[PDB]
Fold this protein.
Amino acid sequence: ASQRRIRTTFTSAQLKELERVFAETHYPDIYTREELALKIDLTEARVQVWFQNRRAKFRKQER
């Protein structure tokens, strides 16, 4: 099952990696999301949510 979309379930190491990938690729593709899912050991849906919310936050903070 997926995790709550508004809850953080990641470590500082996991968030660091997720942030790094975001900076490089803002919209992970099929295979990238798959690998990301393996990195966090959670459904791909969880990756999609994180990057979707992170992208929204980016746009809000974008100047």
